[PDB]
Amino acid sequence: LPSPTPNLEIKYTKIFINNEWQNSESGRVFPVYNPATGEQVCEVQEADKADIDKAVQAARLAFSLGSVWRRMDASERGRLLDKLADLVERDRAVLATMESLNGGKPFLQAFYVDLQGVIKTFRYYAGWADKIHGMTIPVDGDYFTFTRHEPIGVCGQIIPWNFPLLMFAWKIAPALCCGNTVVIKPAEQTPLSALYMGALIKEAGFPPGVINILPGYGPTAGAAIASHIGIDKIAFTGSTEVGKLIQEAAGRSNLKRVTLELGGKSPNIIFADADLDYAVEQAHQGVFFNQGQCCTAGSRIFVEESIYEEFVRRSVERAKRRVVGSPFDPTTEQGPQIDKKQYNKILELIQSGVAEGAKLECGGKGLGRKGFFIEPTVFSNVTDDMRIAKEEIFGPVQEILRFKTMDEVIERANNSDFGLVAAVFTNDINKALTVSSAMQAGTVWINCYNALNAQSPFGGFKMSGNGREMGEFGLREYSEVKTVTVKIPQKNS
């Protein structure tokens, strides 16, 4: 198996604008921490509005008609994405080490999940660049009508700390595929892998200004992007709460186009005719993967009454043996939460569960004295009115509910402001299709959980988001459609 890079240097700590490494305009640098120890790893140049402004100017010039990026064959945009994939593959262990050190992700999981996703995302979209087609249309009257799908322009992108590098790839790959330029802001907690990608972008040979990477905080760098009158499109992944602010800012400023990938409280429905041991393991991973810090978390597990007691027992056994420890250690299943703020929020919600009469089966406490580790926690006898049944915990807390009928569980699963994902476990084709069709969710899994692929679109119903990422449909957010209608002397079919 691969090992964490020894003596990892953090070489790239500056703002990346126009393929040049720059100090912040203010001169400030901000600290970056290791969530396993609480100790400072390094300092990073702290971008604010002045820096955003320079980045937008660079991105706008790079998007100008006649520029290298605009004149480039679509196929050559694709080649650049493929080159970037090659470089990520070359530096896979370094990047996984960085994600582990900075993000708290177990190194092997960062290597085999996150980095695999990054590489596959770039390789997938590399293939789309010269296959984005408009249409020719048999309109009424003596006209020739066609559509031209063009890049929108300068795209602002704001990404979270739970999947720093993977979300970076999810954002820039479709944007670049379509020929846009980018100003991207990684989360304050987790800038490092994004900055390393700046070095790879330069090495790959992207024209200056096509990707600009602006590390810094939300009210400064993030807000400056959201309200910028020179940015045509914003893509945001994060909390539903902040998503509302993004949409508001878009409306108030320049009506920039918006897509949002937001939170969830996703249902996972287990029928008695499911493969039980498989369902237990899948539901366990479905909530505990990535320290519970997944918008996809299956945080409402509905179990059919006849298998409820056994499902709970097996789930508790599994949670009790789940190995929490140092991200670099190959035995580790679960690393720390990202920071103290998240740690405290999780503990408060656990206490709410106890207070409101959910059965605490195991866990419920922090682990150790350093970093932000929390015991794998299981609640049973959860009911729909409980805070823990409604609020996104974003930590290692499993909630198990009971149901009797398919009609009941469909209603209860759908009774949410959220609708990111859902799942159903059953060997009955009729139940599987009925439930999956009825779910108000952007992705529904049948007899699996957390099965994501570069080829398949992903996004929220309701307040879990607007628009889709990944697959062909991810590209729809990153082009502007132009209809051209030409008068012709006479039309024939």
Ligand X SMILES: CCc1cnccc1C(=O)Nc1cc(C)c2c(c1)CCC(=O)N2
Judged by CB under 8 A, the chain residues 144 through 173 that form the site for a copy of itself are 145, 147-148
Distance from C-alpha of 354 to C-alpha of 141, rounded to nearest angstrom: 70
Distance in angstroms (rounded) separating the CA atoms of residues 491 and 141: 8
Beta carbon nearer to a copy of itself, 268 or 380:
268
Name which of 78 and 160 has its Cβ closer to ligand X. Answer: 160
375 is catalytic: no
Q: Smallest distance, Å, CB 457 to ligand X?
A: 11
Q: Is 207 in the site for a copy of itself (CB under 8 A)?
A: no
302-305-310 Cα angle (round to 5): 90
Q: Which of 49, 79, 120, 390 binds a copy of itself (CB under 8 A)?
A: 120
DSSP 362: E
Name which of 16 and 168 has its Cβ closer to ligand X.
168
CB of 229 to ligand X, least distance (A): 25
Only one of the segments 264-272, 338-346, 389-397, 437-445 lies at the binding site for a copy of itself (rule: CB under 8 A); that segment is 437-445
Cβ contact 286:319 at 8 Å = no
Report how far residue 368's alpha carbon sits from residue 136's, in angstroms, rounded to the nearest whole number.
64
What is the largest distance, in Å, between two alpha-carbon atoms of the chain? 81
Rounded to the nearest whole angstrom, what is the least distance from the CB of residue 444 to a copy of itself in the complex? 5
Q: Residue 474 carries which DSSP code? A: G
Residues 105-124 that bind ligand X (CB under 6 A): 113, 116-117, 120-121
Contact positions with a copy of itself (CB under 8 A) in 438-457: 438-439, 441-448, 451, 453-457
Burial of 71 (0-12, 13-18, 19+ CB in 10 A): exposed
Does residue 239 belong to the site contacting ligand X (CB under 6 A)? no
Tell me which of 254, 453, 483, 485 binds ligand X, using CB under 6 A: 453
Contact between 459 and ligand X by CB under 6 A: the answer reads no
Residue environment code for 116-143, b if the CB has 16+ CB neighbours within 10 A, otherwise e: ebbbbbbbbbbebbeebeeeeeeeeeee
Pick one of 65, 321, 385, 492: the residue that binds a copy of itself (CB under 8 A).
Answer: 65
Give me the residue label for tokens 């369902």: 279
Return the closest-CA partner of residue 216 out of 20, 53, 31: 31
Q: Which does 472 bind (CB under 5 to 8 A by kind): ligand X, a copy of itself, none?
A: a copy of itself
248 Cβ partners below 8 Å, 6+ apart? none
260 is a contact residue toward a copy of itself (CB under 8 A): yes
| DSSP-based three-state secondary structure for 76 | helix
Q: How many CB atoms lie within 10 A of CB 93?
A: 17
Q: 99, 261, 399, 477: which is the annotated catalytic residue? A: 261
| Residue 204 binding ligand X, by CB under 6 A | no
Within residues 141-170, the interface with ligand X by CB under 6 A covers: 163, 166
21 bridge partner residues: 16
CB of 172 to ligand X, least distance (A): 13
Q: At what angle do helices 115-128 and 92-103 cross, to 10 degrees?
A: 120
User: What is the CA angle 124-130-134, rounded to 5?
Assistant: 115
341 among the known binding-site residues?
yes
The piece of 36-44, 208-216, 292-300, 329-337 that touches ligand X (CB under 6 A) is 292-300
Q: Does 362 qualify as catalytic in the annotation?
A: no
Q: Cβ 185 to ligand X, closest distance in Å?
A: 18
- Which residues, at least 6 apart from 450, have a Cβ–Cβ distance to it below 8 Å? 285, 286, 289, 294, 296
| Sole binder of a copy of itself in the list 9, 487, 490, 492 (CB under 8 A) | 487
Shortest Å, Cβ 425 to a copy of itself: 9
Min separation Cβ 302 and a copy of itself, Å: 18
* Residues that contact ligand X, how many (by CB under 6 A): 15
Question: With CB cut-offs between 5 and 8 Å by kind, which of a copy of itself, ligand X, none does residue 432 bind?
Answer: a copy of itself
Is 43 labelled as part of a ligand binding site? no
SS3 400: strand
Residues 6+ apart with CB under 8 A from 153: 60, 63, 180, 181, 232, 233
Q: Which residues are annotated as a binding site for NAD(+)?
A: 159-161, 185-188, 239-241, 341-345, 392
Which residues are designated catalytic? 261, 295
Task: Note the residues at the interface with ligand X (CB under 6 A).
Answer: 113, 116-117, 120-121, 163, 166, 289, 294-296, 450, 452-454
